[PDB]
Amino acid sequence: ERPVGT
Amino acid sequence: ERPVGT
Amino acid sequence: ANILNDWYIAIKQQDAESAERYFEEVKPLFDEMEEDQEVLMYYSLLEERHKMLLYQVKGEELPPHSYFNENHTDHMIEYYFFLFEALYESHKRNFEKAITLFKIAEKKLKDIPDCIERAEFYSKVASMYMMLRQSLISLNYINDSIQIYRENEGYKRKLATSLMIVGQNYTDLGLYEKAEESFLEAIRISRVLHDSLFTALIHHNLSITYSAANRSQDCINALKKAIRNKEWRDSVYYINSLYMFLKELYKIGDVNKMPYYYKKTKEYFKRKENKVYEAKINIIYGLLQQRKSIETCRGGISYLYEVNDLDSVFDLSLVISEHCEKHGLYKEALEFSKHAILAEEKMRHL
Amino acid sequence: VANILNDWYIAIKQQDAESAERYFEEVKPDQEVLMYYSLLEERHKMLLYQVKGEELPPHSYFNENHKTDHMIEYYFFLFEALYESHKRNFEKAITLFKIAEKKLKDIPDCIERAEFYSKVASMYMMLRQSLISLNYINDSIQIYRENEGYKRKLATSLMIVGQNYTDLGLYEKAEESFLEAIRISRVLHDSLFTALIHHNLSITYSAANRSQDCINALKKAIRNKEWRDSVYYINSLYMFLKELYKIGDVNKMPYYYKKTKEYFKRKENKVYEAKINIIYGLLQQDQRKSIETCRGGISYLYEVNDLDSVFDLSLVISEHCEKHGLYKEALEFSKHAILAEEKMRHLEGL
């Protein structure tokens, strides 16, 4: 899963 | 396989 | 134009409240009024950038219409045009074009001396490379951004966001303790800032690190703190939390709590469209159904290859493989074991 | 003496093994320079291992040792980074490299910088850290390309570039790099180096499923008498057996297998013993014996931290089982391939 908000 | 001589 | 520069400063600070005020104030100045074409291009580029900001930090949906859908000589406006298009292609998982557009912008950046602009560029390149699990490259870039952000005032939101990239990079390197420390520092910053939506966002991303560390209850607890925020639940990112819930619940076998979160996914999809996470949720929940399960998993995996979401293919192929292995379906377990290798090798190729 | 030592070290930085061997014999006939001489004696043996395939001494100055000139400390950390890198203790190597990198900031020799970057790039390529390795080696190549006497270092560096490209799925670009390196060695009239580069090129052909090109390159390598006397001979013999196995030419393997036994009679190499045993175990007809041989070789490769071999051979074993309908075992080694690759990508020490 890739992080959000970057 | 990894190369040699480097 | 100075208003445009101030607006971009607010974007470079991730101050969405300032950004929206600049956007509302500059719109009359650009109602068939302003004549200079480079200023009109600057305003057109900043309008895209502002929408990307509102998506990044507020979880507001991106407009279907991009100025980049059909537009592809100030050395600044050219750097801006290539940088903002790299972001548009990066978000669409068109990483081949994004990397090229980034390298052109990096070359021009040699002639831009603004330290915040340089930190801004490095943090966007680091974000894309982290999306490819190119962790060391991403860290070298982001480490320069953090150095700048820590030594200048007004960039605490940017320091926090940067720490999330560091943490994910650490998580991709198996450095889960250092990854947790980075997210915790980001959390402190957001509580000092009194930004509870940002705090929810950081908790969601931290849940990815805990999940990768097999710290499942911490992962679920972090997701619970995120979904306690109402703005988060109303955002496009709500579905990401719901998906991480189902996957961690399935991993630990607490299937009795999965219908609860699954039903909320239906309520999200009732109002917001997100085909990537629809496929991902369908894959997870479908594992509870045997042959029907595999056919649904094949459709979801195939769609994720199509939109180039290889990290999800890698993630879910491991889960499907473990599921099939446990049920004695070794041929199908190997088939999705192989999808995970293929997804990972393709991710690293470029 | 100090001038002889620096000339001796310069010859090492040019990979001039003949000069280095003459300096060593000339200096062999109680100060800080004793550390300098002991440091250069280690480096010289690492060169002879690197370039001639001469065995490394059993006792190293580094295994059982304990401020000085800023140069002697840079050398101590760099040369120990090389010692830990070859033992696949990459965690320690990376740490020792970062210390040397800092001290190198106060060393103004551009060739020394090219020397450092090229050793860091080699280590990252061993971890399939391709982009980081390319950034380092590309800087070394520029320095070597603008300086006279460093044709061997340019050639060696192109092999690191080529391997990085092969790890990135860029097989045509990888071939180009090795071919440019081969031309350099023919210009140099260095037939041992030409054999060495052909061996490494054979890895790229194998990765590209160009099996006949792979075998042809290996044939050109083993024709060199010096190559056959080197420790690297077994690597070619192994690459022969593996490629003969892939294409089903089982009738030609007894010829090369007989050659491995003659190598192991004179030299110990448990890593390639395990690797050749796995190839041979794939020819075993008893399922149970075949898998136990693969398990023994793979598990031993985990023990010595040769995860690239685990990844490579587990894919070969998994494909072998897949073709024979043994899906449970195909998955078992499919899983080993993911584990090896994820751990290779991890840096749980640094």
Numbering used by the authors:
A (entry chain E): 501 to 506
B (entry chain D): 601 to 606
C (entry chain B): 10 to 81, 88 to 304, 307 to 367
D (entry chain A): 9 to 37, 45 to 81, 87 to 370
Copy text from the publication.
Proteins of the RRNPPA family are the most frequent pheromone receptors in Bacillota and use small secreted oligopeptides as pheromones.
To comprehend the interaction between Rap105 and its predicted mature pheromone (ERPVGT), an MST analysis was performed revealing an EC50 of 34nM with a Hill coefficient of 1.41. To further understand the recognition by Rap105, we solved the structure of Rap105-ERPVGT (Rap-Phr105) complex at 2.5 Å resolution. The structure of the receptor showed the classical architecture of Rap receptors with N-terminal 3HB domain (residues 1–67) followed by 7 TPRs (residues 89–367). A further 16 receptor residues (Q65, S142, M145, M146, T176, I180, Q183, D187, L216, I223, Y252, Y258, Y292, K295, D328, and D332) formed direct contacts with the pheromone. However, the pheromone Phr105 shows null or weak interactions through two of its 6 amino acids (Pro3 and Gly5). Also, the presence of this proline in the middle of the pheromone restricts the conformational freedom of the peptide, while in the Phr3T this Pro is a Gly that increases pheromone freedom and mediates interactions with 2 tyrosines (Y151 and Y225) of Rap3T receptor.
